[PDB]
C-alpha cells in the first residue's frame, strides 16, 4: 500500500463523503477527472498485465465501467488515472434527464452504492461531437494499448428498442473500439441480429466489436438462451455483470431498501459466479469482461480465473478514491507471480482447468 492509498481510503474519502451528497460527489469526480485534477498514477504497467482480446491490445486489464463518464466528458482523465481501457455511457439516442433526485445512495457500511439514474444522457449527437473532437487522439491511444468502449442505451419512451440500439451503432460505432448493448429468445436474436447487421455495415477501420452486458439477476434459462444466441450470431464478447436488483441478506446501510441497482462489494461474488457460468456455457470461446465489486487484486484475479479476460471497476472509487486503480494493478501483478502465471492471459479461465 502506498501513502496515497492509505491517506485516501482512511482519511480523505471518509471526510469528502461527509461533505458531498452522492450525486454531487459523482459530478465533482467527473469534473475533476476531465480537468486532470488527479493524484499521480505512478504505477507503470508491466508486460505481465498486457492482454490481447476483442481485436485489440490492452496495456492493462483494469477498465472503468459504464456509468462513471456517461457522456464522454472525462475519457483522457480516466486514462491518466491508470485504467487500461475506458467505457463511456450509457448513451441514449435522444437526450433525456433520467429519474428525479435523489437517485444515488451510498451504503458505506457495505462498501456499496445503489443507483436509479434512469439513463440520464446528453444523447448521441452531443457525445458524437465530443468524441469527434478527440478522434485522432483516441486512435493513437488505442494503438498504444488503451482502447475505448461505448455503451448504448435506449430512450425511456421508445417503441422500438432495436432501432434505438441500431441508431447508436450507426452514430457512435465509428468512434468506438467496442460497443455494448445491455440485455423471449427469438426476440433477443432479432435484436442482436439487427445490431450486428448495422455494425457490419460500417467501414472496416470504423467497425467495432459488439458485446452484450448482462445483469446478475437472470434466470438459468435466460443465461442459457443468451449463451446460445451469442454463439449463434458471433457476438464478440460479454460484460458480466451490471448492478443487481437483489438485496443480499446482511446489508447494513440505512438506504438498503432504496429502489435501484446495487453495486460494490455485495455484488462481487454474484458477479464472479455469473462469469463462471457464462464462461462454461460459451466453452471459453467468448471473451468476458468481468465487473462487479472489484476493489483489490484478489477480486480481479478471482474474476480472471473464473473466465474474464478483462475486468472493470467503478464503485470502489467511492470508498478508495483514484489510488484504487494502481492498488488493484499492483496487487494483481503480485498475485499472478505468487500463483505461477506468466501473465494475465495464462490465468484466464484457470479455475475451469
Ligand atoms: C452510479 C452508477 C451508474 C451506472 N450506470 C451504468 C450505465 O449507464 N450503463 C451500464 O451499463 N452500467 C452502469 N452502471 C453499472 C456499472 O457499469 C457496473 O456494471 C456495476 O456498477 C458493477 O461494478 P462495480 O461494483 O465495480 O461498480 C452504473 C453503476 C453505478 C454505480
Ligand atoms: C456514483 C458515485 C457516488 C458517490 O458518492 O461518489 C462517487 C461516485 C462515482 C465515482 C466517484 O469517484 C469519486 C472520487 O474517487 C473521485 C474520482 C475521480 C476524481 C475525483 C474524485 C467519488 C467520491 C468523491 C467525493 C466524495 C465521495 C466519493 C465518486
Ligand atoms: O442509468 C442507470 O440508472 C443505470 C444503468 C445501468 O445500466 N446500470 C445501472 O446500475 N444504472
Supply angle C-alpha 333, 84, 3, rounded to 5.
Answer: 55
Rg of the chain on CA atoms, in Å: 19
User: Could you give all domains of the chain from N- to C-terminal order, each with its CATH number?
Assistant: 3-352 (3.20.20.70)
* The three cell numbers locating residue 59: 496495456
Which DSSP string corresponds to 232-300?
A: HHT--EEEE---BS---TT---TTTTSSSEEEEGGGHHHHHHHHHHHHHHTTT-S-EEEESS--SHHHH
Phi-psi region of 274 (alpha: psi -120 to 50; beta: other; left: phi over 0): alpha
d(CA 208, CA 152): 13
Map grid coordinates 459530478 to a residue.
Answer: 27
Q: Using CA atoms, how far apart are residues 279 and 186, in angstroms rounded to an integer?
A: 22
What is the resolution in angstroms? 1.7
CA angle 332, 33, 92 (to 5 degrees): 95
Which three cell numbers mark 334? 503480485
Cβ of 300 closer than 6 Å to ligand 2, yes or no, is no
Q: Which string of DSSP letters, residue by residue, matches 2-23? A: -HHHHHIIIIIHHHHHHHS-HH
Residues in contact with ligand 1 by the CB-under-6-Å rule are 65-67, 70, 89-90, 104, 113, 115, 117, 151, 182, 213, 242-243, 263-264, 267, 291-294, 313-316
Angle at 217 between CA 213 and CA 219, to 5 degrees: 100
For ligand 3, what atom is nearest to the CA of residue 242?
8
Class of residue 101 by CB neighbours under 10 A (exposed 0-12, middle 13-18, buried 19+): exposed
CA distance 326 to 81: 8
Technique used to solve these coordinates: X-ray
Determine which helix (DSSP H) or strand (DSSP E) holds 127, and give its type and residue range.
Answer: helix 124-132
Q: Return the number of other C-beta atoms located less than 10 Å from residue 345's C-beta.
A: 17
Q: Which residue has the cell 464478440?
A: 236
Task: Tell whether 242 is in a known binding site.
Answer: yes
CA 8 to chain centre: 23
d(CA 113, CA 212): 23
| 203 CA → ligand 1 middle, Å | 30
| Closest by CA position to 183, among listed 140, 228, 141 | 228
Listed by the residue before each break, gaps in the chain with C–N over 2.5 Å are: 183
Give, for 87, the enclosing helix (H) or strand (E).
strand 85-91
With CA atoms as reference, report the closest residue to 71 among 155, 130, 138: 130
**Cα(312)–Cα(291) distance, rounded to whole angstroms?**
5
Beta bridge partners of 209: 178
Closest CA to 215 of 150, 133, 275: 275
* Beta pairing, strands 85-91 & 104-107: unpaired
Amino acid at each position: 500500500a502506498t501513502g496515497d492509498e492509505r491517506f485516501y481510503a482512511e482519511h480523505l474519502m471518509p471526510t469528502l463523503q461527509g461533505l458531498l451528497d452522492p450525486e454531487s460527489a459523482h459530478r465533482l469526480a467527473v469534473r475533476f477527472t476531465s480537468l486532470g485534477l488527479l493524484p499521480r498514477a505512478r504505477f507503470q504497467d508491466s508486460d505481465m498485465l498486457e492482454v490481447r482480446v476483442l481485436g485489440h491490445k490492452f496495456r492493462n486489464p483494469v477498465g472503468i465501467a459504464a456509468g462513471f463518464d456517461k457522456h464522454g466528458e472525462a475519457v483522457d482523465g480516466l486514462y491518466k488515472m491508470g485504467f487500461g481501457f475506458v467505457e463511456i455511457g450509457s448513451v441514449t439516442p435522444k437526450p433525456q434527464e433520467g429519474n428525479p433526485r435523489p437517485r444515488v445512495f451510498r451504503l458505506p457500511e457495505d462498501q456499496a452504492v445503489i443507483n436509479r439514474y434512469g439513463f440520464n444522457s446528453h444523447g448521441l449527437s452531443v457525445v458524437e461531437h465530443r468524441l469527434r473532437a478527440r478522434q485522432q487522439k483516441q486512435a493513437k491511444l488505442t494503438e498504444d494499448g488503451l482502447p475505448l468502449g461505448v455503451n448504448l442505451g435506449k430512450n425511456k419512451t421508445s417503441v422500438d428498442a432495436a432501432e434505438d440500439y441500431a441508431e447508436g451503432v450507426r452514430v457512435l460505432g465509428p468512434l468506438a473500439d467496442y460497443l455494448v448493448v445491455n440485455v423471449g429468445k427469438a426476440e433477443l436474436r432479432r435484436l442482436l441480429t439487427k445490431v450486428l447487421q448495422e455494425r457490419d455495415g460500417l467501414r472496416r477501420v470504423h467497425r467495432p466489436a459488439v458485446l452484450v452486458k448482462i445483469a446478475p439477476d437472470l434466470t438459468s434459462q435466460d443465461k442459457e438462451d443468451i449463451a446460445s444466441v451469442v454463439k449463434e450470431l458471433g457476438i464478440d464478447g460479454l460484460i458480466v455483470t451490471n448492478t443487481t436488483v437483489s438485496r443480499p441478506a446482511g446489508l447494513q446501510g440505512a438506504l438498503r431498501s432504496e429502489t435501484g441497482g446495487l453495486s460494490g462489494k455485495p455484488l462481487r461474488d454474484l458477479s464472479t459466479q455469473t462469469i463462471r457460468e457464462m464462461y462454461a456455457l460459451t466453452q471459453g470461446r467468448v471473451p468476458i469482461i468481468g465487473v462487479g465489486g472489484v476493489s483489490s487484486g484478489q477480486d480481479a484475479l478471482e474474476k480472471i480465473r473464473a473466465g474474464a479476460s478483462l475486468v472493470q471497476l467503478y464503485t470502489a472509487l467511492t470508498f478508495w478514491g483514484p489510488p484504487v486503480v494502481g492498488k488493484v494493478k499492483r496487487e494483481l501483478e503480485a498475485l499472478l507471480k505468487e500463483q505461477g502465471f506468466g501473465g494475465v492471459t495464462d490465468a484466464i479461465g484457470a479455475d475451469h482447468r
